[PDB]
Each structure stands twice: as C-alpha cells, then as structure tokens.
Design a protein around this ligand. Sequence first.
Ligand SMILES: Cc1cc2nc3c(=O)[nH]c(=O)nc-3n(C[C@H](O)[C@H](O)[C@H](O)COP(=O)(O)O)c2cc1C
Length: 169
Amino acid sequence: AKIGLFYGTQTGVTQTIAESIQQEFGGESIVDLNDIANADASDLNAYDYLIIGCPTWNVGELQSDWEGIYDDLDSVNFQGKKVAYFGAGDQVGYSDNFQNAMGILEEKISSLGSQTVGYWPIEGYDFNESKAVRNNQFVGLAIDEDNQPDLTKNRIKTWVSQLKSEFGL
Ligand SMILES: Cc1cc2nc3c(=O)[nH]c(=O)nc-3n(C[C@H](O)[C@H](O)[C@H](O)COP(=O)(O)O)c2cc1C
C-alpha cells in the first residue's frame, strides 16, 4: 500500500488503535499494518508515507519492541518521507511522562531527515510534562484509553481526516 503503519504494543491497546486508523483510511488497499516486533529497519524504506505507533511504558520509556529496533533506525534514509505518529498513554497515572515514547521516536526519525505531519492540540488533555510536545502541540495523535476511552473514536476520525490532506489522499 501507499502508507506503511508500524506499531509496537505490550497489552494490545496500540494494535487496536492501529486497526482503527487503517479502517478509517479505507482498509488494506490504502494502509499496510506492520508489527514492529516482526520487522527489520529496512522495511521502513519501502514507503514514502509512514505512520508510527508506540505506547509509553515504564515511566517515560519506549515499548520494548521499538526499543529493540531503535539503534537500527540510523541505517534508513528518511529524507523525503512524511511521517505521522500516534501513541497510547495514561495522563493521570504518568502526568510527567505522558506520551514520551511518541516524542522519543519523532525526535529520532526527524533527525534522520523526515518531515513530521499530524500535529495535534494539547488542550483536550491534562498532564504536566511530555517529551512529545513541541511549541504547544503534540507531534502526533495522543490516545488515552485508560482515562478517555469515550474520545478515542472521534479523535481517530478527526486525525485521519487531517492526515488524508497531508498524504495526498
Ligand atoms: C507499568 C506501566 C507503565 C506505564 N508508563 C507509562 C508512561 O510512562 N507514560 C504514559 O503516558 N503511559 C504509561 N502507561 C500507560 C500505557 O502506555 C497505556 O496503558 C497504553 O494503553 C498501553 O498500550 P499497549 O497496550 O499498546 O502497550 C503505563 C502503563 C503501565 C501498566
């Protein structure tokens, strides 16, 4: 497909979100779903449009599967690629490390020459600190199933609608 979605997940929440995003875009013919646990860094090279999903774990850390491939990311040339990010987190329980994984990955991938698209407003959340915030916006979609599951469906619909414009759909 045109868009490659790569996600990592520990308790399955990020996978469910990935599946909803693929569905909102139009299905398998538009978005390829890939579990980063089963991929090689070079698989990211096959796409010009990428969506990266990762939940934050263990107080500000990357989900372990993303942690595993992190050092290999240097071998991929992201210049010219448009990359969007999404993450699952818990704003109440980890108010000072909310969605940090998403920010760690964005800082790394953009330093390799990619363009970040998909900024999201921070006003619909209550947290103290997040490494995924730059100039008062999140660098990608923040989902919180632990505290705001009622908002997930419309957050995804709205985000995907905005991304379509960025990805030329
Ligand atoms: C042990 C543990 C640590 C967590 N640490 C963080 C954290 O530092 N920041 C955050 O935003 N959420 C944190 N969370 C919340 C998870 O990211 C959240 O539950 C998410 O839905 C997990 O998605 P997964 O099922 O895709 O792995 C933590 C949850 C647990 C159980």
